[PDB]
Amino acid sequence: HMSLAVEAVKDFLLKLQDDICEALEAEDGQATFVEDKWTREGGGGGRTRVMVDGAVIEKGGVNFSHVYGKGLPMSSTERHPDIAGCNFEAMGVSLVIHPKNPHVPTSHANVRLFVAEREGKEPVWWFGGGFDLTPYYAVEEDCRDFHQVAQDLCKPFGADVYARFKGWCDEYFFIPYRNEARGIGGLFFDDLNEWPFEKCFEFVQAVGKGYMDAYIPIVNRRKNTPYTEQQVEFQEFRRGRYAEFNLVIDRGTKFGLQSGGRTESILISLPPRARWGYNWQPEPGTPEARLTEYFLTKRQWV
Amino acid sequence: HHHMSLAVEAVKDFLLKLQDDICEALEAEDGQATFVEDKWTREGGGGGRTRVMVDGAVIEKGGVNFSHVYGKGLPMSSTERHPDIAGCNFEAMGVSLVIHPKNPHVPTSHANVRLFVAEREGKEPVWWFGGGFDLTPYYAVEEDCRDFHQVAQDLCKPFGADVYARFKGWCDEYFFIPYRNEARGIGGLFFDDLNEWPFEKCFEFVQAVGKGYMDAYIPIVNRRKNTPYTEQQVEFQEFRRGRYAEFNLVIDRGTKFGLQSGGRTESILISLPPRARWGYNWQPEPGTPEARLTEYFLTKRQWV
Ligand SMILES: O=C(O)c1cc2cc(F)ccc2[nH]1
Ligand SMILES: O=C(O)c1cc2cc(F)ccc2[nH]1
């Protein structure tokens, strides 16, 4: 019976959300998050905060969800058969930020906790999450700083923690049919429970704080970079690739929509505008081609 | 076999001509842009011709593809619905198209005709046909929906009293976004695993279906292409094309199977719109012609 450990987690997630929103509002200075609190048939709910048409953030969502349920949904019994009929609690923050300026990267973060209550056995549980950076017109110094924040926050938890979860981020956020990474990586983890519960929780706190320390400065630094409408077009074609990942490959997006999740809360990840063209490529040799030729394939920043 | 090999080739030839014919008709309606052909050759066996059209007077993004692929043993994600024929030599061919008009008052449309054949040693071959056609309007007109369906009902009739009912029903169940509780378009025809009839009969049906597409769709384009439209209308169109992307990337099996089994990405994804939009809790204004698409047309389902 972890009810109080779970409440501590809940209290943190709600605070992280406030903390990310406030910070992002402070960067925009024009628009604020509008909140949409929701509920489901015997399944808790969430508080979806969205920002649209700001000075800096064109489309942005920072969601809190807390899902109850009797028996895991149908899709999870393929991955988690051993606890398919269990009472479960799932709670987390998910965010995707799509800046107006192409020179500010898109970014994503997640912290979450799954707890399954067992008949006779102590409860099964794991954390999960990460953050990652999806530049359009990348900047070396930004990528390095991003990753450095990730490695630094990992340092207190073990010597191999960054390596493992950085690599996991590279493997996960990849479009195999296009042989192409989605962004320049960051951290990614799941089924985190090898450490005692308190050490894992502290880790996800560090990942939550880590996001704001990694991303906010990059937004402050590049938001006022001047951009042409040609660069917006490139950005819109790149967002096609983002839509693909989220709709074709992403496991949480897929599981969110299969199992009865709130569509509009799940799909805050989709960009404001996206373009697709037959055989679309950026002109090789340009800043536009450099993203895929250099930035997406480096996979070694720190 | 001999008879099947001879028949398979009659099917190819039909498909190659179907494509020229569809492209010609579509070029005839545009007047301005013409299809560009991109021939490609699978490393393993076969290939295809992808024909696309961009920035037309009428067709903003158009894709009419032909494939004929063939190999030793099926791909890895075909050991799940067809494990018993995963080591067989196979042939899969077909024509697949998606048309996205510049004008919002011209519906997007899609059509597909294909054949899969798996040659088996000593046992008769396994084979089936599949495909159909469907209409995805933005600003739907009643008369066009009825007509589109009558053309489908008419081509089916000679094949049997219940054929239109099955494949029109199937179209509604298939092209549907469950998580949004929302149809994709106003329907049409859809069928898969078609081998219930002798080969020759199934084949003639897909030929009817293929001809049906031009008969159903080209008049509608000709009728609507010069309808005046606003930037506000194009904006609704692009939000609606978010739903279209959604279906193809999240739900469509053909896209799933193609992308995960080593098919040619840009060819598979001609289906995707030139521009799309998403907004959190975006819905058309109630009481507007925009809202009428989802409130009426998409839930109507009964046209003929
Ligand atoms: O695997 C999951 O269940 C899951 C992945 C994921 C990613 C997000 F960004 C948000 C919620 C999620 N849930
Ligand atoms: O099920 C398939 O293999 C398949 C479905 C499909 C749909 C299209 F529009 C085009 C080709 C296809 N192949």
Curated annotation (Swiss-Prot), chain B:
| Pathway noted in the entry | Porphyrin-containing compound metabolism; protoporphyrin-IX biosynthesis; protoporphyrinogen-IX from coproporphyrinogen-III (O2 route): step 1/1
MF GO annotations: coproporphyrinogen oxidase activity; protein homodimerization activity
Region entry Important for dimerization, spans: 52-61, 244-279
Q: What GO biological process term is on the record, naming one?
A: protoporphyrinogen IX biosynthetic process
Q: Where is the active site?
A: H110 (proton donor)
Protein location: Cytoplasm
Residues involved in substrate binding: S96, N112, V113, R114, G262, G263, R264
Alphabetized Pfam families for the sequence: Coprogen_oxidas (PF01218)
State where it is primarily located. Answer: cytoplasm
Q: Provide the Gene Ontology terms for cellular component.
A: cytoplasm
- Gene3D superfamilies under this entry? Coproporphyrinogen III oxidase, aerobic
Query: Which EC number(s) does UniProt give?
Result: 1.3.3.3
Keywords annotated in UniProt: Cytoplasm, Heme biosynthesis, Oxidoreductase, Porphyrin biosynthesis
Q: Provide the reaction this enzyme catalyses.
A: coproporphyrinogen III + O2 + 2 H(+) = protoporphyrinogen IX + 2 CO2 + 2 H2O
**HAMAP family according to UniProt:** Coprogen_oxidas
Q: How does it assemble?
A: Homodimer.
| Free-text function comment from the UniProt entry | Involved in the heme biosynthesis. Catalyzes the aerobic oxidative decarboxylation of propionate groups of rings A and B of coproporphyrinogen-III to yield the vinyl groups in protoporphyrinogen-IX.
Q: Which family does it belong to?
A: Belongs to the aerobic coproporphyrinogen-III oxidase family.
Q: What is this protein called?
A: Oxygen-dependent coproporphyrinogen-III oxidase
Organism from which the protein derives: Leishmania major
